[PDB]
């Protein structure tokens, strides 16, 4: 009851190219006024925050669209940040450490949306 036997071969070849730009950390460039001062109070790290403020003052005069003054979900105001790329503590502690947010938004009249990821600093 012998007999043992086996075989197998299969390969191939890809060729890749290359695109890559200057490793840098700074992607962004769009101060509004107060939040900037939020930033600021981050910018002694190496860290980045991105701040965008649209604000939303009032419409045209020939559309309505079935508007009743409200503005909650759209969102014009926006406050992130970018710490060495690897968010772990408590996100609420680097918004809390520049308190920048609900600062310019509130003149917008709808709601905001923040994200903040660092890496951890307790181990």
Known sequence: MRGSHHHHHHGSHVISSIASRGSMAEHQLGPIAGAIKSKVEAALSPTHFKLINDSHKHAGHYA???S?????????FRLE???????GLTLVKRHQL??????????????ALAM????????
């Open 81 to 87: 940040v970018t710490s060495d790329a690897f968010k």
């Open 64 to 66: 309505r669209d079935g």
């Open 68 to 76: 009743t003054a409200s503005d909650a979900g759209e969102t014009h």
């Open 98 to 111: 520049i308190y920048g947010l609900l600062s310019d938004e509130f003149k917008a009249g709808l709601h």
């Open 116 to 123: 903040t990821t660092k890496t951890p600093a307790e181990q």
